[PDB]
């Protein structure tokens, strides 16, 4: 299940995990909310780990990253569409994800036409394919993920309010890890052990009171990886298992 890797921020994070697990048997579309650079993929990990999803193939797409003028047509079915003769071409991930999990990542930065097409696909069921003249709704688990406040975008008109409200029935948020400092020491120890294993170090030398105080003082806007990234960088820089670490540098730009 690989859930123990995430290890949760706290029992409150474990409570959200329990709620998500209760929701896992449901294959209805879902909305994922979480801070940028905060383990949002691991949220999709449990949804994929759902037993119904465990049977099918999980497909997750970065909506912001996925962008091309032809790709606008490529996302469309065309499973029989042959304008250049390539009928066998499929909707892509849209066709591939059939029978398994589907996930839209960074959906905020997407063309509005693509959003409407997905919203149209979401509304009712697939029919009247572009080439096949008969699209078919596939019982494939799907969910959406975003970071910013799309409500502000819709207020500015950037967010499709129809899809947003439509997806506003299965929204789950990820609280900032900066709030949960308890698991911070645990995750830091896990990262230290993993680095010691990777760099063939004798063991993790551990932290210090100065190091713990600095970790507390750090704002840590990125926590899932950026905190771990700083941990790994400090482990590499230290190169000394003689003593536990007491000086951790976060801002690489900070000379000396």
């Amino acid at each position: 299940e690989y859930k123990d890797n995430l290890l949760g921020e706290a029992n409150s994070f474990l409570e959200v995990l329990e709620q998500v697990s209760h929701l896992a048997p449901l294959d209805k579309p879902v909305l994922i909310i979480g801070e940028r650079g905060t383990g949002k993929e691991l949220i999709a990990s449990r949804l994929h780990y759902l037993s119904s999803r465990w049977q099918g193939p999980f497909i997750s797409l970065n909506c912001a990253a996925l962008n091309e003028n032809l790709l606008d047509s490529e996302l469309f079915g065309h499973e029989a569409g042959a304008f250049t003769g390539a009928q066998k071409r499929h909707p892509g991930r849209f066709e591939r994800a059939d029978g398994g999990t589907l996930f839209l990542d960074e959906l905020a930065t997407a063309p509005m036409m693509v959003q409407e097409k997905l919203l149209r696909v979401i509304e009712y069921g697939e029919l009247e394919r572009v080439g096949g003249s008969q699209p078919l709704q596939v019982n494939v688990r799907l969910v959406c993920a975003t970071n910013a406040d799309l409500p502000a975008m819709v207020n500015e008109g950037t967010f499709r309010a129809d899809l947003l409200d439509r997806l506003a029935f299965d929204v789950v948020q990820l609280p900032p890890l900066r709030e949960r400092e308890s698991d911070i020491m645990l995750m830091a120890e896990y990262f230290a052990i993993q680095m010691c294993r990777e760099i063939k170090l004798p063991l993790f030398p551990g932290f210090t009171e100065r190091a713990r105080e600095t970790l507390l003082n750090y704002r840590w806007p990125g926590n899932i990886r950026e905190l771990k990234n700083v941990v790994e960088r400090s482990v590499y820089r230290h190169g000394t298992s003689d003593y536990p670490l007491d000086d951790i540098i976060i801002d690489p730009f900070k000379r000396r």
Binding site: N69, L70, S73, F83, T84
Partner: protein, 48 residues
């Protein structure tokens, strides 16, 4: 949109192929076309 001449995008195929009937029509055969029409009318009983 905008006016431009960028040279990289998707497209479709050219004019659809295998228009044999149109190809024969485009060529002019004069009396030979008349002879072919006579042969076809012999083949087609619903033509006069």
């Amino acid at each position: 949109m905008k006016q431009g001449l960028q040279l990289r995008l998707s497209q479709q195929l050219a004019m659809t192929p295998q228009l044999q009937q149109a190809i024969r029509l485009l060529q002019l055969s004069t009396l030979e076309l008349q002879q072919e029409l006579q042969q076809a009318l012999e083949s087609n009983p619903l033509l006069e």
